[PDB]
C-alpha cells in the first residue's frame, strides 16, 4: 500500500482482534481495539456507502414503444438512446467501485500509520521503535498510552 503499514513493516494482522479494525497488543508483568480511530473510520465508511447509494438513487421510467413496418428509422433512433445511456451508467458504476476500493484500502493503511506515529510521539525517548509496529519500553501506564495521556516526564 501507499502508506506501507498494512502488509508492509507490520507484516501480519491479529486474528485475536475481533472488537474492531485497529488495536493494541502489549506484553508486561500481568489485546484490545482503539475506540477513537476505529469509530472515526466506521463513520467514513457509512457516509461513503450512503453517498454511493444516493448518487444512483434517481429513477426515470423507460417506456417500450411500438412502431409499424414503415417506422424503421424512429425505432432505430429510440433503441440507440436506451443502448448508449446504459453503456455510460455501466461504465460509471464499474469505474466508481474500482476508484473508491483503491482509496478505502489506502485510507485503512494510513489509519494504522497515524496510530503508530501518535504512540511514538507520546512515548518520545523512553521507548525504541523495533521496526515491526512494536515499542520496547504498570497496566495504568499501558492504559495511559492507549487513551493518549502518558506523561514521558514522569519516566
Amino acid at each position: 500500500g501507499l502508506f506501507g503499514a498494512i502488509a508492509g513493516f507490520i507484516e501480519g494482522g491479529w486474528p485475536g482482534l475481533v472488537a474492531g479494525w485497529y488495536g493494541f497488543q502489549h506484553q508486561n508483568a500481568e489485546i484490545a481495539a482503539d475506540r477513537d480511530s476505529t469509530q472515526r473510520a466506521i463513520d467514513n465508511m457509512q457516509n461513503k456507502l450512503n453517498n454511493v447509494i444516493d448518487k444512483m438513487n434517481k429513477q426515470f421510467e423507460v417506456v417500450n414503444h411500438e412502431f409499424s413496418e414503415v417506422e424503421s428509422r424512429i425505432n432505430m433512433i429510440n433503441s440507440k438512446i436506451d443502448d448508449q445511456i446504459t453503456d455510460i451508467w455501466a461504465y460509471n458504476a464499474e469505474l466508481l467501485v474500482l476508484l473508491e476500493n483503491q482509496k478505502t484500502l489506502d485510507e485503512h493503511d494510513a489509519n494504522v500509520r497515524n496510530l503508530h506515529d501518535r504512540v511514538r510521539r507520546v512515548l518520545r525517548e523512553n521507548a525504541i521503535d523495533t521496526g515491526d509496529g512494536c515499542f520496547e519500553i504498570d497496566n495504568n501506564c499501558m492504559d495511559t498510552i492507549r487513551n493518549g495521556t502518558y506523561n514521558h516526564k514522569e519516566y
Binding site: I6, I10, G13, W14, H26, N28, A90, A93, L105
Partner: protein
C-alpha cells in the same frame, strides 16, 4: 522487558474486491451492490391493480369485439398486461390507421366507461347488420358493439345526417370504418348506390371517404375489406356524421379520465395478491441495493440497471494472514 505494539484485524473471510491496479484483493468486510434475483409474479402498485388480458387484445376491447362482452361495463388499472399469444382484436379484415398511437393513448389513461353518442332508432336505414367474420362466443354471426353497419331500407338509401355534442367534462374516444365491397352487386345490394360520399367532421378535423369496388384475397373467408379510423372529441366540441352508404357509424364512444402508468407489458407471469414499489416485465423486486441486472425497462421506484452480475465495494481493510 515490557513492550507495546500496534496491529490490525484479520478473519477467515474469502471475500475479494477488484481495484484499478490489482485483481481479486482479499478484504475483511464487503457490501454487494447488485441484487441478482426476481420474484416472477405480477403485483399491484400504489395506483391500484393492473388489467391482465389473456382472451382479448386492447384494440378489440376499444372496437368492442363481440367475444369481448366482459369489458362493456368498463375497467380502471395501474398498468396493462397482454399475454404473448393469438389474441382477438379486429374481427373483420382491415387495418387501423395510427394503431400504435391509439394503443399508446388508451393505455396512458386510468379509467374508461362507455357512453351512447348516436341513436339509430330515428335513422331511416337498417342498422342490424352482422357478419360470419365477427362471430360471438356462441359462434353466431354478430358485429362490433360500439359501431353499426348501415345498409338500405325498403330498397333505398337516402343521405343521412346526425349530430352529437360532448358535455361530460371529459374526452371521448370513438371509432368508425369504411367498407369496400368486392363486387358491383354487393355495393347495389347493401347500399344501392354505385358511388357514395361518407364524411366525419368536428370543430378541429374535416375528413371525407370514398369506396372503390374491387375483390381482395380472402383473410377470414371474406372477399371484402374495411379501413378503420379513430378520433378524440374534447369537452364542449361537436361531432357530426353524414353518409349515403359505405360507413360503419359510431353508436358508442369511450369516456376517458385520469393518468395510468402508461404501460402495456408482454409476459405470461401469474397475477398475485400483493402490493409492490417496483414492477418489471420479468417480475417484482424489493431491495436496499443501488443496482439490479434483470431489465432497464421498469415501473415505479427501482434500483439502477447495469449488465454486471456482481459489484463488491470494500468496507473493511486488506485481509493479511499472520
Amino acid at each position: 522487558p515490557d513492550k507495546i505494539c500496534i496491529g490490525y484485524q484479520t478473519n477467515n473471510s474469502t471475500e475479494t474486491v477488484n481495484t484499478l491496479s490489482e485483481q481479486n484483493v482479499p478484504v475483511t468486510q464487503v457490501e454487494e451492490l447488485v441484487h441478482g434475483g426476481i420474484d416472477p409474479i405480477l403485483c399491484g402498485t400504489e395506483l391500484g391493480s393492473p388489467l391482465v388480458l389473456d382472451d382479448c387484445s386492447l384494440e378489440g376491447l376499444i372496437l368492442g369485439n363481440p367475444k369481448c362482452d366482459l369489458y362493456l361495463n368498463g375497467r380502471e388499472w395501474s398498468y396493462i398486461v397482454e399475454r404473448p399469444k393469438e389474441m382477438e382484436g379486429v374481427c373483420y379484415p382491415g387495418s387501423i390507421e395510427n394503431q400504435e398511437e391509439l394503443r399508446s393513448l388508451f393505455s396512458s389513461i386510468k379509467k374508461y366507461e362507455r357512453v351512447k353518442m348516436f341513436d339509430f332508432t330515428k335513422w331511416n336505414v337498417t342498422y342490424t347488420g352482422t357478419s360470419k367474420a365477427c362471430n360471438n362466443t356462441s359462434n353466431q354471426g354478430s358485429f362490433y358493439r360500439s359501431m353499426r353497419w348501415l345498409t338500405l331500407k325498403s330498397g333505398q338509401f337516402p343521405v343521412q345526417t346526425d349530430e352529437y355534442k360532448n358535455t361530460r367534462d371529459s374526452d371521448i374516444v370513438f371509432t368508425w370504418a369504411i367498407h369496400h365491397p368486392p363486387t358491383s352487386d354487393e355495393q347495389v345490394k347493401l347500399y344501392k348506390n354505385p358511388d357514395t360520399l361518407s364524411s366525419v367532421t368536428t370543430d378541429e378535423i374535416n375528413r371525407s371517404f370514398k369506396p372503390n369496388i374491387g375483390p381482395r384475397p380472402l383473410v377470414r373467408g371474406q372477399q371484402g375489406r374495411m379501413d378503420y379510423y379513430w378520433a378524440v372529441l374534447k369537452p364542449g366540441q361537436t361531432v357530426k356524421i353524414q353518409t349515403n352508404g359505405n360507413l360503419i357509424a359510431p353508436e358508442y364512444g369511450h369516456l376517458i379520465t385520469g393518468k395510468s402508468h402508461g404501460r402495456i407489458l408482454k409476459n405470461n407471469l401469474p397475477m398475485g395478491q400483493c402490493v409492490t414499489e417496483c414492477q418489471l416485465n420479468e417480475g417484482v423486486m424489493n431491495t436496499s441495493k443501488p443496482f439490479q441486472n434483470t431489465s432497464k425497462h421498469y415501473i415505479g421506484k427501482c434500483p439502477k440497471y447495469i449488465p454486471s452480475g456482481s459489484l463488491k465495494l470494500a468496507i473493511g481493510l486488506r485481509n493479511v494472514p499472520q
